[PDB]
Design a protein around this ligand. Structure first.
Ligand SMILES: c1ccc2nc(COc3ccc(-c4n[nH]cc4Cc4ccncc4)cc3)ccc2c1
Ligand SMILES: [Mg+2]
Ligand SMILES: [Zn+2]
Length: 305
């Protein structure tokens, strides 16, 4: 059972899930239990599913099992603080989508897989890794005793898999820019309609971005340490690009590491702040993410001064 400190701190948007890997499953079960019900999934089936998901994440610096549960936690905190908006089925789906959203990631971007001519990029031309993450999700569900959705009707089953599919695809950051532009225009014209399925999908997609980027909404020590793991992957990819004979973008070039703070400024300005600003306009109870994001922007500006 969860320690008292976790029971309290887990409700904070800026909760960090800690270094004890064996606690992460119970943290996820607790979150799912509170967001749906303890008669939401069969406990034994769910545990088996969780452990098989864990096993198909890799030991990479950032796109690992810890990131998966951290992203699920952000989604938990958004849903907990926006009660009455999402159906039981959406909440179930979104927490599972978050847990599964980087399955079998290698620590390389879609663009690297494309330049490499990796077989996955011939199979899935766009949002390559994200299509694979969803394929892995389904393959795990199809294992004997791993169908956590077995009590649902076939219709509800197809529905939840489509919720998961759209939510995982949406974590392809290339899609965020267009989605967020559409959502901002909808907000300002007063045309956003949460009862319209296409708008609803967009909002869920932004939520997925916000959860995926959530390292920038933690307290500064967490944010700064998490950035080390992110760059360990980016620089490894940059090395690989150099080995293909291709000059990497500065973000992936370890030789431009002194430009990290400027690079962070750029990301906060073009990606993170607009993401949480738009999210807060649609779901005002998510304001603490935006606030923590602004505080971290200020820290990066302080690093530069
Ligand atoms: C030279 C040197 C350093 C540079 N640094 C940047 C900053 O890039 C960032 C900043 C934050 C994040 C981030 N933090 N938490 C989640 C994410 C998003 C992310 C993570 C993993 N894979 C894909 C997306 C990603 C990239 C930009 C340009 C640069 C140029
Ligand atoms: Mg991903
Ligand atoms: Zn992710």
């Amino acid at each position: 059972n969860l320690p008292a400190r976790i029971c309290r701190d887990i409700e904070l948007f800026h909760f960090d899930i800690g270094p004890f890997e064996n606690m992460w499953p119970g943290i996820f079960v607790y979150m799912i239990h509170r967001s749906c019900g303890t008669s939401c999934f069969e406990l034994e089936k769910l545990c088996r599913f969780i452990m098989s998901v864990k096993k198909n994440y890799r030991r990479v610096p950032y796109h690992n099992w810890k990131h998966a549960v951290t992203v699920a936690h952000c989604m938990y905190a958004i849903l907990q603080n926006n009660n009455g908006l999402f159906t039981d089925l959406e909440r179930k789906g979104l927490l599972i989508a978050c847990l599964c959203h980087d399955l079998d990631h290698r620590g390389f971007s879609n663009s690297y897989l494309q330049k490499f001519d990796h077989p996955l990029a011939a199979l899935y031309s766009t949002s390559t890794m994200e299509q694979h993450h969803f394929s892995q999700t389904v393959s795990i569900l199809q294992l004997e005793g791993h169908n956590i959705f077995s009590t649902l009707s076939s219709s509800e089953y197809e529905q939840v898999l489509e919720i998961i599919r759209k939510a995982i695809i949406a974590t392809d950051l290339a899609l965020y820019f267009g989605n967020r532009k559409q959502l901002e225009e909808m907000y300002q014209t007063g045309s956003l309609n949460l009862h319209n399925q296409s708008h609803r999908d967009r909002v869920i997609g932004l939520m997925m971005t916000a959860c995926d980027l959530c390292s920038v909404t933690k307290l500064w020590p967490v944010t700064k340490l998490t950035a080390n793991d992110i760059y360990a992957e980016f620089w490894a990819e940059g090395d690989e690009m150099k080995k293909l004979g291709i000059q990497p973008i500065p973000m992936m070039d370890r030789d431009k590491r002194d430009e990290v703070p400027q690079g962070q400024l750029g990301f906060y300005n073009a990606v993170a702040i607009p993401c949480y600003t738009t999210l807060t306009q649609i779901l005002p109870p998510t304001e603490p993410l935006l606030k923590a994001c602004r505080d971290n922007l200020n820290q990066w500006e302080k690093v530069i001064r």
